[PDB]
Design a protein around this ligand. Sequence first.
Ligand SMILES: [Fe+3]
Length: 324
Amino acid sequence: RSVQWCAVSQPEATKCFQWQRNMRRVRGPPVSCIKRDSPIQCIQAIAENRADAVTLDGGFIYEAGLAPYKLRPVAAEVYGTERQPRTHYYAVAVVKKGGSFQLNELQGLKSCHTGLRRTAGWNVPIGTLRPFLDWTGPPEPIEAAVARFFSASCVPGADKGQFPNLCRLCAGTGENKCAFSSQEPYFSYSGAFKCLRDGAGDVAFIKESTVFEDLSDEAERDEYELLCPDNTRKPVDKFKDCHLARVPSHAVVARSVNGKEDAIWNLLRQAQEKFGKDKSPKFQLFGSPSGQKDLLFKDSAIGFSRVPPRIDSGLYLGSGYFTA
Ligand SMILES: [Fe+3]
């Protein structure tokens, strides 16, 4: 009963079958592929024993750990470089150089977010910005307070009908507009950075590596800066002293009871050695096809680090903090 990986979209399922084929070719541990249409559908499938593993951003690790699911993080993604690896990242606010607006002066501007309920793209910035919002609190959806704070935004996964403003800057065509998938050009970290790069938004809520990885000409980095919580703007390489939060990396979650943790780890450990960073030219576990974003795992990540037993989502997440 090989590990059953859960894809949250068709392109992800396609990559999973490619991963599977390659594992077979190299005689490594097998990986089955189950296809679903959203992170919560994968979380449910796992809780239901219909799947075993799925990589999630912290905002979703939180949701996955709640009843009736109770999934726990078993393996964390590793970012940084081989010489300087790390299992954490920085939520940053990137802007075009030239402007004078600061973090406390975003009312009425345009924003680009990785996706609804994601760490760097939603939870941290919206949390940080709360003092500047006019949220009356529940039962009002915070999306309403946000849609009336920013004049227009691209928040992949937002309710187009209820909060049209949150999807207006999204580039997807037809029903793909504002999709929480690669169907939306402005989805995830790279998509949100593109939303800013293209000039659709004034600020992009992403991570520190995006700008360095997405510009094929290093000279273009000069066109960008970061909005610091102390209300100053600094170069994109100063993220350590200029970020909205430092948070633990995305992680593969599994069932807390009979979750097949040793199997999942053996699969990931081997998948990394054979198809990880600069390993096989035939398949890249951390690479996605043209126009697709972070299929299965974070594009350009470098490996995994096993999470010690009995650490639940709450405990895993407790390492993240926000500079409000
Ligand atoms: Fe994230």
